Amino acid sequence: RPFQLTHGSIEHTLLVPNDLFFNYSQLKDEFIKTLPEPTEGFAGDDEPSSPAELYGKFIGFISNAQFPQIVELSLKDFESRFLDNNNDNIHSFAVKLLDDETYPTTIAKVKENIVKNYYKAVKSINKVESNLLYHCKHDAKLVAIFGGQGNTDDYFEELRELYTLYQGLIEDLLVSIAEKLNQLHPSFDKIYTQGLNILSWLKHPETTPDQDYLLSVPVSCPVICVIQLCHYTITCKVLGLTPGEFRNSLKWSTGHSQGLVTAVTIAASDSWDSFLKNSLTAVSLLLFIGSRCLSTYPRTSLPPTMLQDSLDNGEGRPSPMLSVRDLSIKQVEKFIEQTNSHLPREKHIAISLINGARNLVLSGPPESLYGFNLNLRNQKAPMGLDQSRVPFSERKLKCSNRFLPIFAPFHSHLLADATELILDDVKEHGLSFEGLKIPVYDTFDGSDFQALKEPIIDRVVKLITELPVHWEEATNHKATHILDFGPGGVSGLGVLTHRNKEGTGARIILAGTLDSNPIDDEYGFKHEIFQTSADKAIKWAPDWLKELRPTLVKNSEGKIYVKTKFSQLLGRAPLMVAGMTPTTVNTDIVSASLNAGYHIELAGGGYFSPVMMTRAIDDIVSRIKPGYGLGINLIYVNPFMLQWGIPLIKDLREKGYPIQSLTIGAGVPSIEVATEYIEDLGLTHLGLKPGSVDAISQVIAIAKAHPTFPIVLQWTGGRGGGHHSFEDFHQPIIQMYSKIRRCSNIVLVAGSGFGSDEDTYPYLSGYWSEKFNYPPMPFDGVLFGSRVMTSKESHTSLAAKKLIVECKGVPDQQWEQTYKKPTGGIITVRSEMGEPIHKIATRGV
């Protein structure tokens, strides 16, 4: 007889067995009286808002009642009704519940009372799943990374909610860990009297002291280790895999400043008792490190004046760490020695840790670091200064420097004296690690812990305190999937190590939080690790070395072409010719080149009436091979050109001429103007070249509104054009490339100073970001404007062609000093409108 649970406006119907409807009903009488009254759309945090959530609260309420033979039958009914062929993949079902429109989109009503009750009522999960994801060794590789100290401010509620939902998978673990913690507590009194009892704090939230005490290194070190241990144990337990054999699925593992202890402990574990023993030894070491790093360098009272002035300048609360962003290492090291020239060696500021080319953290006493950032604020420029109007070569350095949530000056000379005491504690207890199995890459040297003459713990204590962090040298990965079990979630190490590996084939899967999915899907979440599908269980990252790498093709007549994401639309070389008002108005430069098989667009500035355009287009079409098409380069600054050209293109397309592309010149139009361009007048792609970061945002907005029509971006970096919008050729796109590629219909080509294969190949392949320490960043095509002027087809005077030939070039990094002298015979001059113009340096110019 069917059983129907009702609450508010939602009901769930399930087919229960007959001779249980009596005792299955008694639970129902006890279930309705424990839930809140409905209020304006099921908005209560404890209130169900979906049939699955309502039945999950039913299956979790029946667990506290001592009445078996129904709990497992209800679990099986839930799995059959809601988890089709993924009965052990509830993480995917929970996050798919978000996509439903009936359920109000929020993570609070999904994660708990569905996943909490499921694993509270589940039986033993010792069931090996479809673990074929790593069975293909040459195609998939797993690397576990471990976060460090200060990835987030309030890390404690991470472990709070992990115990709140995963009590059944960590209950025997955290009690055992805290027992050793409290056994080792009394030897280090008088420095933190407020206790170190995690169990009492979690069970009774009122027993937990303030976060000023909690965030301290001596307290947070054992707690962060417990966090990553619980995350790894949950990872091994949800799939029902022994940690010793789940470690077999991993190629190698390493950790952050603090996470290296977990990274090396992760391979000393074989069985559940062995892993528990190794975790017990690890959590003891972190107590010693926290205690002696606080007693060796106790942080004293800081005057309210300096912290107030630091907060008023947009920084954080002053800390032993100063994070400076957006500057190279050679600049940071240059500035820190200048800063320390006024400081002794006891307050010296030296490179502590390197999160990337443009994100470093320096170490020292808080007054020394505030003296450093006082200087940096003197050297820097505001965010709202609008750097676009002054040339890039002579703008001011931009940075955002602030202090991290850590209470110990790690990775500097300051703790170098503590290490000798620290290792003494290692000798004072049974702190020892057995044979390593998976390679662990050194944080400083990058080598393996297996080939060590010295032990492990006594060297990692030297590494955390004294040796600097060359973070990318440690994570020189050869793998596809990277799993972070540590703190922070979105605010931690995972995202900033994803930014360093965006296109190197590394797929970042966040095991800390489960609130998928992000709008861009840069990184995965907890569900991806536990997916049991054969080939659908693995989400692959953008591998821009192979994915957007060019390929080739052969023709039936025996000739060879290039296969790219611009050539394929063109059906020809991925090498276009930009529209130039002097140059590309000749019928012969467009017609006699299309016959060869290359793409050129005609610039409308050389024509002034629609009849002239029509007479030119007709002449080009009459002589090109029948079937090819041509583009039109329009200009946005003059409304007259627009108003006599847009009507022309519409009715010429209605007639059916080979008019194929519309490159809008300087000035990206609005969404409404570009709207009819895309829809009404019927082109294949729209050339919509911007000249600034705001313009690139505007064109991305134009691309979102029309997620069907190709849009060739044609971003010129103002290095070789006529009306060169003076900007760097790299920075405006180095920060927004992976904001452009979130588009099914975006095309990205680059110009501004391309003349040959050698200088264009790096941009197509993507290796142009090597000099800027970024992943491969491929371009769809490259446009050529200044290198085709000396062509035979161009009607530019032969004498000017010669003058250009004996006119030499300019190395890239010097192009912007063309405002003073004839740099390679080319200077910038003001136009009548104020736009800068590149012109061959001549007597007239």
């Binding site: 390929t551 080739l552 093709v553 052969k554 060879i560 072409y561 290039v562 296969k563 394929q568 059906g571 070389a573 090498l575 130039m580 002097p582 006699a592 080149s593 060869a596 290359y598 500035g605 029948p626 098409g629 007639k655 059916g656 080979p658 290095r719 070789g720 054009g721 501004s752 100073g753 391309f754 003349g755 040959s756 294969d757 264009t760 190949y761 197509l764 050529f784 404007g785 200044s786 290198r787 085709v788 000396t790 062509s791 035979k792 530019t796 062609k801 010669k802 030939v805 070039g809 300019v810 192009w815 063309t818 390679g824 015979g825 113009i837 590149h838 061959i840 001549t842 007239g844 110019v845």
Partner: protein, 170 residues
Amino acid sequence: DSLWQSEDLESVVDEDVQRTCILHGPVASQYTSKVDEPIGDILNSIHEGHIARLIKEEYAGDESKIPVVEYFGGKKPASVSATSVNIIDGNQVVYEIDSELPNKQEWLDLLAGTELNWLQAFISTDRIVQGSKHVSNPLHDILTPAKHSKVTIDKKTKKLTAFENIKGDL
């Protein structure tokens, strides 16, 4: 209007280049060393340069490994990606239609198939050249799904045949 004088030097005063202004790029100028050469040959130089490097970086100097396609282009810059489930062909294929399985785009792709062949190009293309005159593809209009019709592409896409039940007869 100081842009045309470089183009037409014979008009200006005494055909003096130094009096006129030529717009050119400081970064691309060193690449411009040859004068009065075909633009086709320039873009060639670049194209076969990319050929050579892209071969000698992963193809190990072998052009056989290259994935030759029949016609290069058509359905989007990316490799042709329709609804992959409905991207199918076969030797003996008949496509019965009802109200359950019509939809314009997916029907067109289903008729197109998998291989980049003459039929796939003919159906999928959004434009037909009429003596150097790009117009709309008529297959899109004439191959619209209709109730109780039937499309047969038997013998590995040698020919497509669309039937409809005229006067109650297919």
